[PDB]
Design a protein around this nucleic acid. Sequence first.
DNA 1: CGCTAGTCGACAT
DNA 2: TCGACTAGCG
Length: 346
Amino acid sequence: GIQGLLQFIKEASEPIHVRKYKGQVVAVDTYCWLHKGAIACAEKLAKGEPTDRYVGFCMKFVNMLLSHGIKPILVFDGCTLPSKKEVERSRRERRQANLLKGKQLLREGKVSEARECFTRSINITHAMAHKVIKAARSQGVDCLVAPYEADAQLAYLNKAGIVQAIITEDSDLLAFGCKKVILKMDQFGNGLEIDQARLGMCRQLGDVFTEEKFRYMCILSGCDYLSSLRGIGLAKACKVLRLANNPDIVKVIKKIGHYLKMNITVPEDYINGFIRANNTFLYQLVFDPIKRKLIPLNAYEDDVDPETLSYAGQYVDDSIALQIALGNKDINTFEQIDDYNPDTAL
DNA sequence: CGCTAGTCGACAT
DNA sequence: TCGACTAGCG
Ligand SMILES: [Mn+2]
Ligand SMILES: [Mn+2]
Ligand code: NA
């Protein structure tokens, strides 16, 4: 996500407990519980030996929310975004490297250092995620699979009024424009809340509290979609948007050396990547739970051409998008691996 | 001070 | 995977 963003807007945060959302709906970035639950059984998972410790880990987090009168909607990552296939492969190479080197550290004798190797090789698969789906649906807990990144799907559920808060550990939710983000929640509900309107409490943030300017700031500092220019962090990027009274962000990026008084050369392909990064934060395909239709995160503006937004995900038939979101259709093989039906009893 | 890139812990015995 | 945390550099 946006590295250093949580310490950058710490004034907007407030330690809370999940009881303040009793009787309300809260969506969950379930891949954070999946990863932390897999750390306990990272050895068996890396060895291919059967294990299901992570499911019980994810369930007590769900049972904790159900004990406090909260309706959780579990959201899971779906297809890989087209602009991150090279990134996912390079991360897969590191998982295979720490796996092979981890098995060699066991051959050498050290296990305390091999433990740190197997835990960095954890690959949360869709089969592991579907195990949590069947375990949660057996407890009457709703489950949903995002068309692509769960980051965008969560941002839609919060901005549409379906949920009022989002439990996660990732800071991309703030850049996507969420209303209430709950970070660092333990097994007991002790968390740290960040609201969107409460971003004004950050003095160093300046007038970059509006969603459009704040989204531009997160991108210029570097994100999953576009690396930052060397020497451009969160503070200097925030200074650019403060010192720039120009609404056109394109001319501002070209003058990034004028606002900061630095010799910064802006390549021409960086502008295109920025536009691709902004359109991805804005128009990434999510799944409407009510209407059951593929929609962008935000409604298409009259200036953008939706035909040139393939990097934000391509459309499929709504009947296929429904089965993918229900976890019945495999993300890879597109074959029916389940037959869940929510009608016969979001 | 700000930014880069690296280290390291998470879980739970 | 994601963050917190720090030495090193402008
Ligand atoms: Mn993310
Ligand atoms: Mn994510
Ligand atoms: Na940066």
